[PDB]
């Protein structure tokens, strides 16, 4: 009778067809990812086409229910989720061109190789060729060749495609009543209707910028420390008061400084905690790893893995005759079907990955009770933070000792804690300015604050000011260095990595207080605390039904993003950094360029 009542019954029919199709399609994807055959590729695609065609029809039907007429929020939000046409807001030929450009820059990224003209037959592709050089090469010139020739050959072909992509995405976002395509991306965090828990797309920028200024002291001390270590290694290439050359940061873009550990380790004589050998000595297999992860989640008052998870998952590389995608994934096909695809080896790294992916399955099971649409993490940052806090607790030597993998003969040397925390800082603290600056640039590019004749001029103004990294070769407007990174040329929001990084430390900080943990936050293991498991579950069972502000508040007692716990995790490293940088210049000067002497 009322529009609200009719939309409730439409959603019923929708939840029952979507659950079905999504299952069949997911099963086709499982079959291809576990058994890579030409027949399986064909069946995977036909399912993808059906699912797309289904959602197209359903979007047109959802459109027919005026949102204004609904008072019920969980129904109004579910209807809204469906109503977004996305691409079809543009003309047939304009949408065809957008899909064309999107396809092309994806293809150029995944298939663009760089040849050494000396041998025209031999060329290096980014994966594995170029990526290997950027993560393993110590030769200054080799790294510079790989950094520059990737941007010059591939990063220059992407430049005119990106310009058209920006203008088309903006026109699409304008039609969806967003100001720019960046505002559209920020729409994920937006919450309206719920008084006290509302969140605006503009607030996100204020909150990322305020939290970032609090990271600036630790990051400055980290950057200065790294610059000192790098300066010793390449003496005649780095300035004690300048930026760090982009080609000397451990990876193709310096996204994360984890590979710099080799050259920045504080205590080189002290060994590392790698229970790999202990697992091999105790005859552990892929099954014992997943059974140990299950024990972890059951100890926190969480459900045991379903009987179907044990029979249907592929937790080992399938021998030698059938090929399989070996990326560790957590599948949730619907209808109670939960699987993990992981080509598991008896290593500590795989053992920790079992906890991360099994945490995703735990989140999946918790919100599986919700209606189909609302079966997702609270915001784009949420699901990845959940899996990560498990691998945090599992990696603690305290945990390892209790599970028998770490010998009780292991004495906690505070030098190993500094080696550990620096390796952590290199990944986590180091990626925050990179992630911030990249999105800041992207948001302003859509905003219309940076013209095309300034795109690269500003990209390197921002890399020097915000990140404290300098380009080793002068890049003009024929280059497109942002696009030479996966997410930029593959149309993916990057801010998720900033938000989720701050979330995971908030989550751990809250669950560790619930676990009545005493001492350094980096040594916390939340095992056997069913109170911490209840605290976490309260949010996990919510899914996307309630605002992320309220979801977060259900765990940490706060409606907003917070740096305080991340800084708290790294406070012992920070005092050490503050001591080691006593005789060094902390901070950078933007005028120094490696190429300009």
């Amino acid at each position: 009778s009322t529009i609200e009542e009719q939309a409730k019954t439409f959603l019923d029919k929708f939840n029952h067809e979507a659950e079905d199709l999504f299952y069949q399609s997911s099963l086709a994807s499982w079959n291809y990812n576990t058994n890579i055959t030409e027949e399986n590729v064909q069946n995977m695609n036909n399912a993808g086409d059906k699912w797309s065609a289904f959602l197209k029809e359903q979007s047109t039907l959802a459109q027919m229910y005026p949102l204004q007429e609904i008072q019920n929020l969980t129904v109004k939000l579910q209807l809204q989720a469906l109503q977004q046409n996305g691409s079809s807001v543009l003309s047939e030929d304009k949408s065809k061109r957008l899909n064309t450009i999107l396809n092309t820059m994806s293809t150029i990224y995944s298939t663009g190789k760089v040849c050494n003209p000396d041998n025209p037959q031999e060329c290096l592709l980014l994966e594995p060729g170029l990526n290997e050089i950027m993560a393993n090469s110590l030769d200054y010139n080799e790294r510079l060749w790989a950094w520059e020739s990737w941007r010059s050959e591939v990063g220059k072909q992407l430049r005119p495609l990106y310009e058209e992509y920006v203008v088309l995405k903006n026109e699409m976002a304008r039609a969806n009543h967003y100001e720019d395509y960046g505002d559209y991306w920020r729409g994920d965090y937006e919450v309206n209707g719920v008084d006290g828990y509302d969140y605006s797309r503009g607030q996100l920028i204020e909150d990322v910028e305020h939290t970032f200024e609090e990271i600036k002291p630790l990051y400055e001390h980290l950057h200065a420390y790294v610059r000192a270590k790098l300066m010793n290694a390449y003496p005649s290439y780095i300035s004690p008061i300048g930026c760090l050359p982009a080609h000397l940061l451990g990876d193709m873009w310096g996204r994360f400084w984890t590979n710099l550990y080799s050259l920045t380790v504080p205590f080189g004589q002290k060994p590392n905690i790698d229970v790999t050998d202990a697992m091999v000595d105790q005859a552990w297999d892929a099954q014992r790893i997943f059974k140990e992860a299950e024990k972890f989640f059951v100890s926190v008052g969480l459900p045991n893995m379903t009987q179907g998870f044990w029979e249907n998952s592929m937790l080992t590389d399938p021998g030698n005759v059938q090929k399989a995608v070996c990326h560790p994934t957590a599948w949730d096909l619907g209808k109670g079907d939960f699987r993990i695809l992981m080509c598991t080896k008896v290593t500590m790294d795989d053992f920790l990955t079992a906890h991360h992916e099994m945490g995703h399955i735990q989140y999946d099971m918790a919100y599986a009770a919700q209606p189909f649409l609302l079966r997702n993490g609270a915001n784009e940052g949420f699901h990845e933070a959940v899996g990560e806090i498990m691998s945090l607790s599992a990696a603690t030597p305290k945990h390892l000792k209790s599970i028998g993998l770490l010998s009780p003969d292991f004495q906690e040397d505070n030098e190993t804690e500094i080696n550990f925390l620096l390796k952590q800082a290199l990944t986590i603290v180091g990626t925050l300015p990179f992630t911030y600056m990249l999105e800041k640039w992207r948001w302003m590019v859509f905003k219309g604050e940076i013209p095309k004749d300034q795109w690269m001029k500003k990209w390197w103004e921002m890399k020097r000011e915000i990140v404290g990294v300098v380009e080793p070769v002068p890049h003009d407007e024929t280059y497109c260095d942002p696009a030479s990174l996966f997410h930029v040329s593959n149309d993916y929001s990057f801010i998720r990595y900033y938000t989720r990084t701050l979330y995971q430390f908030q989550f751990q900080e809250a669950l560790c207080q619930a676990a009545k943990h005493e001492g350094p936050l980096h040594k916390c293991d939340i095992s056997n605390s069913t109170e911490a498991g209840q605290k976490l579950f309260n949010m996990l069972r919510l899914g996307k039904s309630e605002p992320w502000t309220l979801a977060l508040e259900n765990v940490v007692g706060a409606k907003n993003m917070n740096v305080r716990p991340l800084l708290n995790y790294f406070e012992p490293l920070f005092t050490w950094l503050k001591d080691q940088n006593k005789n060094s210049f902390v901070g950078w000067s933007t005028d120094w360029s490696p190429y300009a002497d």
Partner: protein
């Protein structure tokens, strides 16, 4: 003096769909209820309005076994005073019942690879069901004021949707075969005993 054909009901090769649930009348026979209860096979065996131990020590004029297939989650709806798509639109037990609900997992018999679509359930109905009322009409659900005209569309929905029953489904989305024992006593000769 022959035994009631309970195996004919419980061991049927194919069961009915819940919306068009099947009813069998058991008559002129000696019913052994301990054979049914003492088995451990069934995932559920609940008797209402009468104790199962005192069933052998009683005569009725007739017995009715109502059989059908539903998901694991919905098994809690085949009980008096319960609500949801099944209790509301498919099979309704009176709020005050006198009989037994016997249910067991039939993932081995009723869920094929690729999905078994032979089992349907009613998703929409314009009125709640009365106890033991059966509805088999495939009339289009007119959700809106707009006349449907026998065609599926906006505010026009096919009331019957299928259980895609697949062997890899979780227990709550898996097939469960349900048999409901009704006891009848009229001013007429008692055909069933113990």
């Amino acid at each position: 003096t022959n035994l009631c054909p309970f195996g004919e009901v419980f061991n049927a090769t194919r069961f009915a769909s819940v919306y068009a649930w099947n009813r069998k009348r058991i008559s002129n026979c000696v019913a052994d209820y301990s054979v049914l209860y003492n088995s451990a096979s069934f995932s559920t065996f609940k008797c209402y309005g009468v104790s199962p131990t005192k069933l052998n020590d009683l005569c009725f004029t007739n017995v009715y076994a109502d059989s059908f297939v539903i998901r694991g989650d919905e098994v809690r709806q085949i009980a008096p005073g319960q609500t949801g798509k099944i209790a509301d639109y498919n099979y309704k037990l009176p709020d005050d019942f006198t009989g037994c609900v016997i249910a067991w997992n039939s993932n081995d018999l009723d869920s094929k690879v690729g999905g078994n679509y032979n089992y349907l359930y009613r998703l929409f109905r314009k009125s709640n069901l009365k106890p033991f009322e059966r509805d088999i009409s495939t009339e289009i659900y007119q959700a809106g004021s707009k006349p449907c005209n026998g065609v599926e569309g906006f505010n026009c929905h096919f009331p019957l949707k299928p259980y895609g029953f697949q062997p890899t489904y979780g227990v709550g989305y898996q097939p469960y075969r349900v048999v409901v024992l009704s006891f009848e006593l009229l001013h007429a000769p008692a055909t069933v005993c113990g």
